[PDB]
Structure 1
Amino acid sequence: STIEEQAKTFLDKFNHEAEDLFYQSSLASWNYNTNITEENVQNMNNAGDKWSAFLKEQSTLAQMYPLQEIQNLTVKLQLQALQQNGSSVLSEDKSKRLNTILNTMSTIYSTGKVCNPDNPQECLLLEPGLNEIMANSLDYNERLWAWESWRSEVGKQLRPLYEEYVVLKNEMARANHYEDYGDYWRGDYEVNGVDGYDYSRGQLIEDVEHTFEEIKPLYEHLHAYVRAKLMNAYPSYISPIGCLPAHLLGDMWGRFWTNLYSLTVPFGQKPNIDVTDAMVDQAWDAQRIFKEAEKFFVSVGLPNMTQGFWENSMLTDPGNVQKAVCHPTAWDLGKGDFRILMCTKVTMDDFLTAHHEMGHIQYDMAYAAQPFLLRNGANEGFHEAVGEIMSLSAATPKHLKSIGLLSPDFQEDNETEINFLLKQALTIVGTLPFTYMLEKWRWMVFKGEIPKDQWMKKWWEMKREIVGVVEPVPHDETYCDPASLFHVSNDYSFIRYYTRTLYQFQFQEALCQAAKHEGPLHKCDISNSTEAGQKLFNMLRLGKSEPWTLALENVVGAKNMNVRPLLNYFEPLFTWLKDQNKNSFVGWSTDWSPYA
C-alpha cells in the first residue's frame, strides 16, 4: 500500500536473502583465511562477486523508494545504507581501473620485498623481516637504510597509482553528492533526522582539532622525554631543540611507540608486571586463555561463548602443512556464527589480544537481534573501542592477581604505575598526532587544498608541526611515503583509531563510575560488576539502530566525543613528565637542526 510498508517488505526480503548470501561469502572468506589454497581463493572470489552483484541489484531496487516519505528511523537508516551507489555510479572502465588499482596496491604491499643494493641474493619482506629490525635494532644507519630503501621501492611504485587513486575516488565521491572522498569517510559519523542528536560531516574536523589542542601539552611533554631518552640512546644524532629522526621511533612508520619501552623506561631497576613466565610455569594453553577471558566476560554479566565458537574457531597455529593468516581477527560470519582466528602464543600481548577479540565477539553477539543491515557498530570507533576497554581492564595488575597470574605479594608502588602508564602512553597517546596528521593530510589531498606537486613539502611540514618528527633526508615528489602503510594503501579509513582512543577512555570512566571504583582510573577493573555489564549491554544491544551520539549519551551521558577521560587516565604520568622535563626543553622546532 504505502511507500513505507513497501520499503519494510523489501527490507525484510533483503535481510532474509542477504543473511544467507553473506553467510556463504563469510564462510568462503573463513575457509580462505584458515586454509590458504588456490581453490579457496577461487571460492572466495566467486562468493564475493555474487555478494557484490546481489548488493548492486538490491541497491538498484532500493533507490526506487524515496527517503523523505519514511518516518521510522530504523527503516530510514537501512534504506540510507542500502541506497548508496558505491562505485556503481562511476563508469565501468573507471570502476574496473579503480578495482585494478586497489588489487595491484594490495599485491604490491603484500608481496613487497626490499633488500640492500649489491647484496641481492636474499631479501626481507615487511612482516616479519623488516618489523623485527625496526623494533629491535639499535644501529642508526641500518634503520636508516631499511627505512629509506623501503620507502624508495614502495613509494616509487605507488606514487602514480596513488595519483590515479585520488582522482578516481574524488570522481566517485562527487558523483555520490559528496564534497570529496574525505567527506565520504566523514559521512560515517553523520547523523541526520534526530532532534538534538544530529551530527554533521564538518563538525568532525572541528571536534578533532578541539580535542587535539588539549592532547598537545601531554604529547609535547612525552615527546620531550622520548627525545631526551633517544638522545641518551643515540648520542649525536638527536638535537635538544629539534624533531626526532623518523627511522628511530621503534616501528616502520611511527604508528606505535611501544617498541621504545626498553630505551625509555623510567625505573629499569624495578621489576615489570610481565606474566609470561607465570603462564609458562603453569602450562597455560590458549584454550585456558580464552576460558579465562570467558570467565571475565561472565563475571561482568555478559553472555558466554556459544558451542559453535568452541567447535569452529582456530585458536592455535595449525602447522606447516596448513597455511593461515597470522593476524588476529574476530569473525561474525552471520546466522549466529561467531569465530576467532588467532595464532595465539603464550604471551601477555596475545592474552590482551584474546580479550580484545572476544570483546569484538561479544559486541557482534549483542546486536544479533537487530536486522541484518543494522548489524554493525553505531560508528567505526565503537566496534574497536569495546575491545580496547577489555584490553585496558585485562592488563591491570588487579586482574592478573585475581586470576592468579600475578604473585599476591607483588608490591604496587608509584614507580611501577608510572612505567606502566608510560608504556600505555607510548602505545596509545603516541599514535594520536600521527593519526590526526595523516587523516588531515588525506582530507586536504582529497579536498584539493594540497596540489599534487606539493604533497610532500606540505606533508613533512605537517609532520614537523604536528608529530614533531623530521625527515632524515629530503624527499621529492617521486616518493609516496604515506602509502607504505597497510590502511592507506588498501582504502581504509584512519580516523577510527582516534575516535577509538577517545571512546576507550570515555567508556573506561563510565564503567569504572558504574563499578564504583574509588581509586585511580588506571587501577580500575570492571570484573565482578553486573551493573557495569548492564550499562555496557544497553549500548551493545542497539548496534547501528541508534545514533552514536545517543549511544554515547546512554554510556557516558555526553552528546559528543570528549578528551578529559584520557587526560584523567594519564594525570599521574602527566605530573611525573612535567617534573622530569625541568632541565629539558618541552616542544620542538620545525627547522632542520638535528639532521637533514
Structure 2
Amino acid sequence: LDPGLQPGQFSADEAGAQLFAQSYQSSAEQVLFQSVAASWAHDTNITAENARRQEEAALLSQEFAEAWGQKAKELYEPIWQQFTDPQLRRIIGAVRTLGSANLPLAKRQQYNALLSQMSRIYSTAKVCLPCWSLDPDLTNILASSRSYAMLLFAWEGWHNAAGIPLKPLYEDFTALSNEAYKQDGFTDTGAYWRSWYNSPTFEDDLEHLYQQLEPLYLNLHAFVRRALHRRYGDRYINLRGPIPAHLLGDMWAQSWENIYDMVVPFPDKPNLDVTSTMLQQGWQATHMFRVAEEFFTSLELSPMPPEFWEGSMLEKPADGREVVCHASAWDFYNRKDFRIKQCTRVTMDQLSTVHHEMGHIQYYLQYKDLPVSLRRGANPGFHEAIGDVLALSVSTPEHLHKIGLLDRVTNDTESDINYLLKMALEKIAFLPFGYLVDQWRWGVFSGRTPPSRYNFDWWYLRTKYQGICPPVTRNETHFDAGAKFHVPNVTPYIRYFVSFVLQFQFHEALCKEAGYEGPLHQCDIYRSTKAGAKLRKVLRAGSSRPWQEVLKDMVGLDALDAQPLLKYFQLVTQWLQEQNQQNGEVLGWPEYQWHPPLPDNYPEG
C-alpha cells in the first residue's frame, strides 16, 4: 500500500478519533473511486484483462481496509461505543470491521478471483438451440410465449447453463467468506448481514409479518392456478398441487405481471398494460429516463447531473460487447460521478425498473456530503423502497392518463379490481420469494445446508413458500439457486422483502402529507412539494441516525408494519377470497410431490 494512503498517529481518545476519521475520509474516497471505476470498466466490457484490473483494485482496497481497520481497533476498540458524537461512533464501528481483509494474501487472491469468475459465468451464459442470452432473449420468451414446450426449453436451458458450473466455486466462496467474518466476531457471514438491521428480534419479526401476508398469497395463487388450468389443461396443471415454475411470466416466478392478460378479471375494460401504447408512440430509453427524472423534480428533489447523462449506459451495446445487463445504480464516492447501467427495453415493467434505479441515484445525490462511511440507507430496505414508492403513483390509471399513455378514463368497481389485481401480480406474488432467498442462504452460511443439500433445500423452500415445482427433474448436480443474479454476485436479498412492506408505509405517509383524501390505491403524489420535503429529510440522513427513529419521524411508527399494504389491497383481497370459494378451490398444494410430465417429443420441437 502506498505510504500516502497509510494512517499516521492519533491519540486514543475522542479528540484523536475525530482526526482519525477526517484522515481516513481523505484517503478512502481515493481507494473507493478506483475500485468502483475498475468494476464499471469490467461490467460494461467483460474481458479477461478488465477482470485482472478489477482484482488488482480489490486487493488494494483490502490492504487499505486492513491498515486503517487494525489501527482503529488498536486505538479505540474499548471506547468507541461511548463517544459523544453518534456519526463518529458509526464511522469507527464501520472501519473496525475488516471483512475479506482479514484473509491472508493467498486467500484474498482466491476470494477476489471467485467473485470475478462467478460474475462472468452468470452474465455470459447462453442457451443454444438444435444462441440466446438472458437479456433480452430468454426474458422475452418467459414474459410472452404461451407455448409450454418453448417456455420449458428456456427455463431448463437457463438453469442448467448458469447453475451447474457455479456450484464448485460457490462452495469455495462460502467457506472463505465465513473464515473472513469470523475474525470480526460473527458466527457466520449471515449473522454479519443480519446485523445491519440492529434488531435482536429480526428473524422472529419477519416471520410474524409473513404470517399476516400469507393468506393474500394463497388466494392469488389459487386464482392464477385456475387460469393456467384453463389454458394448459389437466395434463400440465394440477388444481391441488404446485404450479410448474416456468409458467408465471418470469424466469424465477418472482413476479407475475407479465401473465396479466391471461388472468385479467374484466377483459372488456381498458388495457392497464400500456406497453403497446409506448411502442406505438415511439418511446425509447432516453424518454423513459427523462420522464422518471421529471417526477423527481416535480417533488423538488434533484435532477440528474450532467455526469449522469454523459456516463451512464442506458441501452445494451450494439457492438456485441459482453456486458452485465442486470440493471444497477452506481455511486463512485467522489461526490460527482453517479451512473445507471441498464439494458433498457421499451415496456411498462421496464419503466418501473427505471424508477427503481433512479431512486437509488437520488439517495446518493442527497447524502453525498456525509462522511463516506455513512453514505448508505438508514437500512438496506430503505434504499430499495425509494423508487418503488414513486412508481406506485406513476402506475395509477389517473397518472398514466396525465402522461398520455392511457386515453380512456373510468372510476367503477370493475376498473378498481383490474388495477389492484395487476398490482397484486407485481407485489403480492413477490412476497414469498423475497422472504425465502436469504432463508436458503442463511442456512448455507450457518452449515445447516451443506453442499450435498443445496438443491434439495432450495426446492423445499420454493415449494413451501411459493407453491411451485421444477418442470423437469433436478438432482444435486444442478444448482438452481445459482441461476438467480444475486447469488453468484453476492448481493443480500432480505432487503427486498423489507422494501415491499415498507414502501406501502411510505406511500401512506406521503399521500397524507400531500393532502390526498381518497382511497390509498388511487393516490398520486406528483407535484406535491410537501411530500418531497418529507422524503428529502429521510434521504439526507444517510445512515447517521437509527432507522427506527427515522421511520418514526416519517410515518409515526418505529417498526415495520403490514397494515398499510393490507389497506391498499383490501378490495381485491376480499374479491379473490370470494371468487375462490365460489369456484370450490383448494387453497394450498396438498399434492406436494406432484411434477408435470414432459411434452411429447421433447426437446425435438
Distance 1:244 1:567 in 2: 25
Shift of 1:554: 1.8
Shift of 1:251: 2.0
Distance 2:448 2:276 in 1: 53
Shift of 1:388: 0.9
CA deviations 1:479-538 (Å, max 9, x no partner) are 222111111122121111101111111111111121122122221111222221121111
Distance 2:567 2:232 in 1: 33
The corresponding residue for 1:15 is 25
Shift of 1:276: 4.9
The corresponding residue for 2:466 is 467
Q: Which moved more, 1:23-32 or 1:500-509?
A: 23-32
- 1:155-170 equivalences under 5 Å are 155-170=163-178
CA deviations 1:201-234 (Å, max 9, x no partner) are xx22111110000111000000101110111111
CA deviations 1:343-372 (Å, max 9, x no partner) are 555543443333333322221111122111
Residue number among 90, 93, 111 corresponding to 1:80 in the alignment: 93
Check conservation: 1:90, 1:175, Cα contact below 8 A.
Answer: no
The corresponding residue for 2:212 is 214
The corresponding residue for 2:136 is 128
Check conservation: 2:352, 2:388, Cα contact below 8 A.
Answer: no
The corresponding residue for 1:562 is 561
Give the letter aligned to residue 412 of structure 1. N
The corresponding residue for 2:352 is 352
Does residue 369 of the first structure (1) align with residue 369 of the second (2)? Answer: yes
Check conservation: 1:538, 1:554, Cα contact below 8 A.
Answer: no
Q: CA RMSD in A?
A: 2.8
The corresponding residue for 1:227 is 225
CA deviations 1:285-306 (Å, max 9, x no partner) are 6555444433322322323333
The corresponding residue for 2:586 is 585
CA deviations 1:387-437 (Å, max 9, x no partner) are 111121222222233344443x52233323322222222222112112222
The corresponding residue for 1:576 is 575
Q: Which moved more, 1:277-286 or 1:450-459?
A: 277-286
Shift of 1:175: 3.1
| Secondary structure at the counterpart of residue 581 of structure 1 | helix
Check conservation: 1:67, 1:76, Cα contact below 8 A.
Answer: no
The corresponding residue for 2:536 is 537
Check conservation: 2:292, 2:358, Cα contact below 8 A.
Answer: yes
- 1:40-59 equivalences under 5 Å are 44-59=54-69
Alpha carbons of structure 1 residues 151 and 31: separation in structure 2 relative to 1, 3 Å:
closer
Check conservation: 1:464, 1:590, Cα contact below 8 A.
Answer: no
- 1:164-243 equivalences under 5 Å are 164-190=172-198, 199-200=199-200, 203-236=201-234, 237-243=236-242
Distance 2:563 2:316 in 1: 41
The corresponding residue for 1:482 is 481
Give the letter aligned to residue 390 of structure 2. M
Distance 2:324 2:595 in 1: 40
Distance 1:97 1:49 in 2: 11
Shift of 1:383: 0.9
Check conservation: 1:245, 1:472, Cα contact below 8 A.
Answer: yes
Check conservation: 2:142, 2:250, Cα contact below 8 A.
Answer: yes
Check conservation: 1:355, 1:394, Cα contact below 8 A.
Answer: no
Distance 1:578 1:529 in 2: 36
Q: Which moved more, 1:365-374 or 1:325-334?
A: 325-334
Shift of 1:577: 0.6
| Secondary structure at the counterpart of residue 339 of structure 1 | strand
Distance 1:79 1:281 in 2: 55
Give the letter aligned to residue 4 of structure 1. E
Give the letter aligned to residue 20 of structure 2. F
Structure 1 stretches lacking a partner, 5+ long: 191-198
Q: Which moved more, 1:421-430 or 1:6-15?
A: 421-430
TM-score, reference length from structure 1: 0.89
Distance 1:113 1:278 in 2: 31
Structure 2 stretches lacking a partner, 5+ long: 1-10, 598-605
The corresponding residue for 1:379 is 379
TM-score, reference length from structure 2: 0.87
Distance 1:112 1:477 in 2: 20
The corresponding residue for 1:111 is 124
- 1:95-494 equivalences under 5 Å are 95-115=108-128, 119=130, 123-190=131-198, 199-200=199-200, 203-236=201-234, 237-276=236-275, 286-315=285-314, 319-320=318-319, 326-333=325-332, 334-344=334-344, 346-407=346-407, 409-494=408-493
Alpha carbons of structure 1 residues 315 and 486: separation in structure 2 relative to 1, 3 Å:
closer
Alpha carbons of structure 1 residues 463 and 558: separation in structure 2 relative to 1, 3 Å:
same
Give the letter aligned to residue 108 of structure 1. I
Distance 1:479 1:38 in 2: 27
Give the letter aligned to residue 103 of structure 1. S
Shift of 1:375: 0.8
Shift of 1:452: 4.2
Check conservation: 2:396, 2:524, Cα contact below 8 A.
Answer: yes
Distance 2:93 2:78 in 1: 11
Give the letter aligned to residue 381 of structure 1. G
Distance 2:123 2:349 in 1: 24
Percent identical across equivalent pairs?
A: 43
Residue number among 28, 48, 62 corresponding to 2:72 in the alignment: 62
Q: Which moved more, 1:519-528 or 1:216-225?
A: 519-528
Q: Which moved more, 1:306-315 or 1:505-514?
A: 306-315
Distance 1:494 1:313 in 2: 25
The corresponding residue for 2:600 is none
Shift of 1:244: 0.9
Check conservation: 1:224, 1:585, Cα contact below 8 A.
Answer: yes
| Secondary structure at the counterpart of residue 231 of structure 1 | helix
